[PDB]
Design a protein around this ligand. Sequence first.
Ligand SMILES: NC(=O)c1ccc[n+]([C@@H]2O[C@H](COP(=O)([O-])OP(=O)(O)OC[C@H]3O[C@@H](n4cnc5c(N)ncnc54)[C@H](O)[C@@H]3O)[C@@H](O)[C@H]2O)c1
Ligand SMILES: NC(=O)c1ccc[n+]([C@@H]2O[C@H](COP(=O)([O-])OP(=O)(O)OC[C@H]3O[C@@H](n4cnc5c(N)ncnc54)[C@H](O)[C@@H]3O)[C@@H](O)[C@H]2O)c1
Ligand SMILES: NC(=O)c1ccc[n+]([C@@H]2O[C@H](COP(=O)([O-])OP(=O)(O)OC[C@H]3O[C@@H](n4cnc5c(N)ncnc54)[C@H](O)[C@@H]3O)[C@@H](O)[C@H]2O)c1
Ligand SMILES: NC(=O)c1ccc[n+]([C@@H]2O[C@H](COP(=O)([O-])OP(=O)(O)OC[C@H]3O[C@@H](n4cnc5c(N)ncnc54)[C@H](O)[C@@H]3O)[C@@H](O)[C@H]2O)c1
Lengths: 344, 335, 332, 334
Amino acid sequence: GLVPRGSHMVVKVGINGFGRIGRLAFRRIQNVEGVEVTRINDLTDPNMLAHLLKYDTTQGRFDGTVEVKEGGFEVNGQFVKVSAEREPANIDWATDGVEIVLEATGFFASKEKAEQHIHENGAKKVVITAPGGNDVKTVVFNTNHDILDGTETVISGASCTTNCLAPMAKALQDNFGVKQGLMTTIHAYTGDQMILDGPHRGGDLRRARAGAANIVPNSTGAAKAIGLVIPELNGKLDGAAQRVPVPTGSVTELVATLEKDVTVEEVNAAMKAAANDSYGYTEDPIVSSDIVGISYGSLFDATQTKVQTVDGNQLVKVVSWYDNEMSYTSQLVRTLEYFAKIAK
Amino acid sequence: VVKVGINGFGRIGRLAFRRIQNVEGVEVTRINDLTDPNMLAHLLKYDTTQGRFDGTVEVKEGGFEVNGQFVKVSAEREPANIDWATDGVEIVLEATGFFASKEKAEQHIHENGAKKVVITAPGGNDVKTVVFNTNHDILDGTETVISGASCTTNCLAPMAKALQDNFGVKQGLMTTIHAYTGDQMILDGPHRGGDLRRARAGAANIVPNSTGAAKAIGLVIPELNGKLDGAAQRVPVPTGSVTELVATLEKDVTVEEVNAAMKAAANDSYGYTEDPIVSSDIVGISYGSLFDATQTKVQTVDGNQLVKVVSWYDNEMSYTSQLVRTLEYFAKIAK
Amino acid sequence: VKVGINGFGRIGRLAFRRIQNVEGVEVTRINDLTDPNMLAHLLKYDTTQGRFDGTVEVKEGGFEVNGQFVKVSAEREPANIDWATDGVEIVLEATGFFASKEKAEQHIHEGAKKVVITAPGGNDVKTVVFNTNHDILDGTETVISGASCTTNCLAPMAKALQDNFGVKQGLMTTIHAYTGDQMILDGPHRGGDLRRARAGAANIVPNSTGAAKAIGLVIPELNGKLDGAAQRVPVPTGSVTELVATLEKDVTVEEVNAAMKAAANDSYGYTEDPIVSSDIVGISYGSLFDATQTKVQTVDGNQLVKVVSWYDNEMSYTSQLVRTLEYFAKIA
Amino acid sequence: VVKVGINGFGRIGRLAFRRIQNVEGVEVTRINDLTDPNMLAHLLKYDTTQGRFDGTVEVKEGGFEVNGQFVKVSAEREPANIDWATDGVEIVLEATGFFASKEKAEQHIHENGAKKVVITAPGGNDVKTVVFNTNHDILDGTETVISGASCTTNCLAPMAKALQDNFGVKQGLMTTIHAYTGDQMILDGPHRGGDLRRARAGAANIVPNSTGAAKAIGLVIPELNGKLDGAAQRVPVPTGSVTELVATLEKDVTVEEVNAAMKAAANDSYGYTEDPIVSSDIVGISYGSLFDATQTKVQTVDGNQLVKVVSWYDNEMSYTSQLVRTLEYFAKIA
Ligand SMILES: NC(=O)c1ccc[n+]([C@@H]2O[C@H](COP(=O)([O-])OP(=O)(O)OC[C@H]3O[C@@H](n4cnc5c(N)ncnc54)[C@H](O)[C@@H]3O)[C@@H](O)[C@H]2O)c1
Ligand SMILES: NC(=O)c1ccc[n+]([C@@H]2O[C@H](COP(=O)([O-])OP(=O)(O)OC[C@H]3O[C@@H](n4cnc5c(N)ncnc54)[C@H](O)[C@@H]3O)[C@@H](O)[C@H]2O)c1
Ligand SMILES: NC(=O)c1ccc[n+]([C@@H]2O[C@H](COP(=O)([O-])OP(=O)(O)OC[C@H]3O[C@@H](n4cnc5c(N)ncnc54)[C@H](O)[C@@H]3O)[C@@H](O)[C@H]2O)c1
Ligand SMILES: NC(=O)c1ccc[n+]([C@@H]2O[C@H](COP(=O)([O-])OP(=O)(O)OC[C@H]3O[C@@H](n4cnc5c(N)ncnc54)[C@H](O)[C@@H]3O)[C@@H](O)[C@H]2O)c1
């Protein structure tokens, strides 16, 4: 009884932080009827933003036309406004008809700080493109978007790694039950790393290092905070990251103990059965470049599955790919579209 | 002074050579590869990842001089055709990657050939496989062919042994996040070994790949035979690797106990650090394995424990350091 | 017209991909040194050029592409390849090992009627940069060259310069992607090159190129006027060609850019956007002039002119190769 | 016994510090940056491109100890607020990239501040710009603010000077194939300086970019003023660069004459090699410029000659070596 809108009823969106996720989100929204970006806010002039939309190192040239104008740029004819406002509270989203804001700066990933968008002459609601702590409903599309009723003011699209891990973990539990698990994600370097060795503004002595010239260990909360997405796994998973020199493209390895004894084929079959728009399945021996730009939020790879049986005991290894950029963004926009229809 | 020959003056061959400069009683008098001395001299002088050669290298007829001393160079495809004896070589380093087998390595041993061979890679199950300071006990000096194991084995072994000796290991799964190597293609292309993943551009991809190091650990630590398995993710750094092990133990542990056990096991071969380092920081190190306490994890869910232990290794110099330790010791006991 | 590919490598596989969208040209046979499973996989998946747009399924002695079977053989010697059995008239010689009239002719026997070499062939072979000198083809030739990657980039740019202002002399530098003839890590180079021996994805690597010297084969009125060299750098594909020249006419920056813009077509593109190498990966221009890098230096009376054009050493070259192949197939 | 302070403990700051360990009579007693000592100590110990620090480093309150000796660390955004004098600092290395101007560098000089400043980058005009062993003649020791020039200038200068002194230079165009640097974005993103090319992922692109080193060579070799221009192609190596110069000369030359002239000009600052090396081979070298004879070209078409000369430089250590030579000499002449 959620009374969703048709794709003909156009919900106007604003993007805060026209960065990697911001710009790719924008690109995907071009092919989503009933969702339209009318305003972008960042920290720079429209010329910079127009150029970065047209040309993209890892995701290819923009499919369309982009022409710069005063206070914005035109995309296939349609003007989009550009503002350069550091404070979310100072952004007059309402003037451009924006109901929902994509918070994609990385600096306001908190209920308190995201709410700052909602005010007189501002936006109605906000989707954070990152974990927003617990306090905020955290959604991995096609895993737990049940949880949305449309009354929420602030929601999170979770992290890149969470959207990869969730379907894979859920499938495991639903079929065999998960006792505990440790995760490693071999991850592309990202914009929060230094291009060369230098002082890291967040105090991280590893993200301080040249990201495109090192294997760089780093912490991730995605495994710990999986309880926010699959409640019956709360406190059962932990993990970490190894950041490596590819500009996008990642993979998540999970090592787990299960309640049921399993064989490799049963695991792969279970994953194949769980496949959908969000969770893909493959038996081809692919590498990271092969998953750049894919629209699955997670792509299980059967060729890497391991089931080790020593004495009575079993360790199970399951691996899924994800383009930390497009995989996440695809999920984000699915979630945004659904949230826009259901919005109160 | 025991005179050594190198077959395959490649990454491991050239670094082995470099280390032998600072090992008294071991001397390389002959190199065999598939090319002229000029190529080999240049590749010794200049090294992308391991820096300029510390010394002088001048090309000559049929070889080159290193700090004055001439080293002979031959270009012989067949090991059986290499007259090692003429240059006084008793032990050969087999480092080509093409003769990693007892049958094929023995081919070096003949009339005017070598007495013994050390393979710079896993050889068969019928060859003694040595990780220095872990199981070099196993050598008596009568062996004709030995293996220095793989890069990953020398990293994993001390870490695993320490775990067992202190807490006992039920089972374990390993992932090594590994530098790309010369058996990968620089760009997408047909892989001569039939591997559809090593066929891909190695410096532009995360590339999954199999490794037997975890399975064949029994050859080094017999009491772990059949308890470990694992795999690799090859990534774009030209050298430098790290080994992650996830294990169940017989004893319940804490993070601090694990780190302490590792620290206690530290020596020339197994290093210990609490600094939050990255791969470039371990390029050129002489430890075969370097435990990193900052990455240790002990997860306790209900009664049950999963333990995670991580050690760095320069797949190049770490392995090579161990190889030369093993070579030195094997040379001095060669009865 | 039925075509065969010898060497299903970077250029071979991309040529194949482009031929999917060329009506009247069809690849019925591939020869390499490996099993069909390897070749099918490498066609489907491509690090730099993206997933294959279509379906590929392996079978006995070949694979099916969107239903249609393509035969695969693994024959080391060109003379032993029975091209005729699969209806092949023209062979793309793309192995890098038979870039010579003598060695390319080895395909013609029964076998194939004609051959296009995907690289500089001898001085006794017609060397074609499409939309620059494909005039030179009459269709009677048995062996032709599609030139090098850097030649197809340089030619339109140089021709435009001469046709408008006249070229006295010029020096070229191409900042070039690393290629399959470099070592992934420091190691013995089979061709004896001490620089291609070095890890290609971790070094700026100087290297020689004959494209500037042998431009006479494409633009005769520039013969002996140009020389140059390469700096190979760590990107897996994508390159750029810088030319520094003295001209007969005094020029301004705007006149040069305008001349280039006027010369623009399917082969020679023009842009004023400040792009980088990734932006030209997969483009179909053989050369893409970049006005933002143009320089005209006037010291005393004298002028040095700098002109720069991008090219995807992979797809740019391949696009030109297939244009040339299509046109050559139409004639006989 | 001259005490130095470093402003901006970055790539050049930290390598300068490292080299000063092996310079008697020069000692760093204070570092100012924008972060805690723990970050700076770690970045000194461990260095992706230049290797582990040769010595011992232990963090302390308000600083760290290097081989026993304490060095103070402050985190002061404004140069005018840095009390350099309290730690005995006479000369400051301005290495932040934000104060490369006489006006802005002078802000270091005040009551309880420093006496003099060396900018690790091109400063204005009316700042003396020094490439060691090329034009350090120009220093008398009375100057308050000096520039150590750019990375590319220290590479180009000895090469160009040698050319003019032997054959005379009419004009020239330069291309430097350059390592990516900290002013590029790690991934495509808004560039604070408005550069649409430095906005792009620096380790995944060939990135064209402008450089003034060729234009402003007149500040170092006056008799070349207005004769040279050039540009850069930034490429994916984390350090290590090479400078190509194409020139017309007053004299007709052969390849061998050019190489010989360069060899004759060789010294501590300008090196000479005939080995076919690549960029990694010059990482960490102490030459400010390293001529490579294997890349020399002399093209003669009709009567006319175009001459090509190429020299390597580690934009990091090559520059830094020159900077410290210049700093040492400037400290002794104050
Ligand atoms: N792989 C990924 O990139 C990835 C995946 C999933 C989630 N995320 C998350 O998405 C967010 C952004 O990631 P990214 O890689 O796109 O970052 P990015 O750095 O590429 O882009 C962030 C943008 O925010 C802008 N910005 C910063 N402060 C601002 C302010 N006060 N007002 C307006 N604009 C501001 C910057 O100019 C920049 O363009 C982060 O929260 C990140 O954790 C990233
Ligand atoms: N990371 C590492 O490099 C590493 C670590 C541990 C063990 N290993 C092992 O060491 C061996 C070599 O590894 P690499 O990385 O140095 O390889 P590499 O490609 O760098 O070296 C191979 C060398 O062998 C030469 N060669 C090939 N066939 C020959 C023949 N018939 N006769 C003489 N020489 C021949 C080649 O010319 C080349 O110089 C392999 O067995 C490998 O598995 C490598
Ligand atoms: N890739 C480029 O940048 C580029 C640009 C312009 C021209 N070219 C030219 O194209 C040719 C191929 O280059 P590439 O980059 O595709 O190299 P590549 O290494 O990708 O392709 C070579 C292919 O030929 C096969 N091969 C080798 N020997 C063979 C034989 N005897 N018989 C049959 N097949 C054999 C190999 O298995 C491989 O698949 C070269 O002549 C090169 O000069 C390449
Ligand atoms: N790296 C090179 O290739 C190179 C070569 C020659 C010259 N330079 C010059 O050296 C200077 C620094 O370059 P870099 O490569 O070391 O950059 P970098 O980013 O590594 O160093 C800059 C450092 O200065 C600090 N900083 C910034 N603002 C500050 C302030 N207000 N007060 C104190 N500290 C501050 C930063 O925290 C950082 O640690 C630039 O002018 C650059 O042009 C660099």
